[PDB]
Symmetry: C2
């Protein structure tokens, strides 16, 4: 098997689909790897370090010559698509809704793509979950940015000039990203609170030292009347916060509004919102994606591409995810795609140009 | 027969701090003092006018500000419009830094003003609660570490997921005074492996206490030969090369900052390394640093922040205000203007009286 690795082109993308250490392991297992000149520069991995790992550092669009497996972060642009070579498998993030044009080009070229956002949440696939690994990065950076943006200390502090209270941080949406925001805001010494409609998620928060927000109806269909009492109770909680980190996203849908116009009016001047849901529209009505705005003294930040900010580790984890996915793409140095495997069945978005996952057929 | 204290809006570009905050203003008032605050003075620090009025002060207009009376409390030194309006016998209290504001210092003596300079508070134990250099350095240190994390392309903490385990980042703090100690405490909380470099052993002792590993050089921490300098340098250089982040904090009053990250030292940093150079305001500890900017050479991101305190404006102002409050006990008796001129703190910090410059280096520069 020969595995190709492109230099990412999407504006502001700094990650690389494989890193040198991972490349070595693929080589030591009998695989061959070609890496575009400069592909790991965003992640501080020089061409020489790849060569050392046994890769040949080729020129772009010489890249797909050998060509059994194309490993990307973002979906491949057209220059690469055209260069595919029949029977090749594309493996990376696809995001049909964000990159429809490139998706229609992949099927027109009759290509085969395993979509990374489509890895199933089963335990056997945990080590392959790139959404999770990238969400961890995003979570960590959410918290760091919350501290950079806030005009107060996160930790409680005593000096000869007195003592200062710790900051009050609420994380809303306690999935993988939110858990790491909790872990990181807690490390910095903030009082941290957690809001999620699911009890299991809230138990995870409690475990990391976050105080769950308890609403009049408890975590696990609801009346318009019951919604109102939840809303008013959450509103009072949010008002008392020094920082809000919102992470609630729903695949192929607009993000839910969790920070409502009337909720935002009650935030004190000097509060910070780090809205991780900006990519799909934002959990907060104030948020302008990719920007930091300030209204009524409320600093609101909607980061896109946090993973690419932490490019060294984001790439390392992602590289490992792909390597771990490889055991079902590669057998004994050979190209042996386990088509019958549930992971591959769930993640295989198209085979020879035919679209195998419903919603993607609809958009096209 | 009862003292009045003025507080301006800061003008210096990018200054967001306020010399007094509302909670502090109330204590001054509740002790029988009056306070006049310029409209908007606390906005940088998210303290609305109404919070000051609530605390018992009159939110007046600028340039009406000094009419009232006796004490001008500032963060940065007062610009000219304010110096011109002083009122004889009145005291200016704040940061002065003549090397940065010579012109304004010249205007202050021309107007025969009296000024207690905040950077001149003596380092004695009784003056600890009054030390604004120290309280501001704590702010600077904390943010140094936060920015180091924002800028680094790797995790600070060691981490395990189903995708593997990741080593903690390796952070060196060079210059272990007040800012350095806070950078340590904060890089530590974030789970970095933290190392500490300082020519003084007591400072290194304070680092160890916060969980930082001291950098041990061939000649040990406390008359040094050129030969002995070479081996310290080469050893430290080996240490620096192994780091993911360098935070440098070494400053010396009224001098260029010492170069602690030499050009040969910088040459050995791997691409992806971060330098937060807290000494940019006086020239930078690192040869690469461009003050107020983030540069990237040979893949090394180097940041030289000016006015970190003003980024943390809520807490910087709070500690500063308390510092000023605490200094009051020597400026104010039972609500009346009573300067204790014979106090060591006051004599150490009194930069000028009725136009007479009473602190050498400032006389010399002027």
């Amino acid at each position: 098997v020969t595995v190709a690795v492109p230099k990412e082109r999407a504006p502001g993308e700094r990650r690389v689909a494989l890193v040198p250490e991972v490349v070595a392991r693929l080589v030591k297992g009998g695989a061959r790897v070609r890496v575009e000149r400069g592909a790991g520069e965003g992640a501080y991995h020089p061409d020489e370090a790849y060569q050392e790992a046994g890769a040949e550092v080729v020129e772009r669009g010489e890249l797909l010559k050998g060509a059994h497996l194309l490993f990307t972060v973002q979906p491949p642009p057209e220059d690469l698509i055209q260069a595919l070579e029949p029977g090749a498998i594309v493996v990376g993030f696809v995001q049909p809704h964000k990159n429809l044009e490139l998706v229609r080009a992949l099927q027109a070229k009759k290509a085969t793509v395993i979509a990374m956002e489509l890895i199933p949440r089963i335990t056997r696939a945990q080590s392959m979950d790139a959404l999770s690994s990238q969400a961890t990065v995003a979570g960590y950076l959410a918290a760091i940015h919350a501290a950079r943006l806030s005009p107060r200390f996160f930790p409680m502090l005593t000096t000869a000039a007195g003592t200062i209270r710790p900051a009050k941080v609420m994380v809303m949406g306690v999935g993988v990203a939110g858990l790491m925001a909790i872990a990181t805001a807690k490390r910095l010494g903030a009082q941290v609170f957690a809001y999620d409609v699911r009890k299991a998620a809230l138990e995870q928060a409690l475990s990391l030292g976050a105080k769950p927000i308890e609403l009049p109806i408890s975590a696990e269909e609801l009346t318009e009347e019951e919604k109102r009492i939840q809303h008013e109770a959450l509103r009072d909680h949010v008002a008392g916060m020094d920082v809000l980190i919102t992470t609630a996203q729903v695949p192929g849908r607009r993000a839910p509004i969790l920070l409502t116009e009337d909720m935002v009016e009650r935030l004190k001047p000097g509060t910070v919102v780090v809205d991780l849901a900006a990519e799909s529209g934002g959990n907060c009505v104030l948020t302008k994606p990719g920007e930091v705005v300030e209204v009524r003294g409320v600093r609101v930040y909607g980061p896109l591409n946090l993973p690419s900010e932490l490019s060294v580790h984001a790439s390392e984890m992602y590289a490992k995810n792909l390597y771990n996915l490889s055991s079902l793409l590669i057998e004994k140095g050979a190209f042996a795609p386990k088509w019958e495997d549930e992971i591959v069945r769930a993640a295989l978005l198209m085979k020879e140009g035919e679209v195998l996952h419903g919603p993607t057929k609809a958009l096209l």
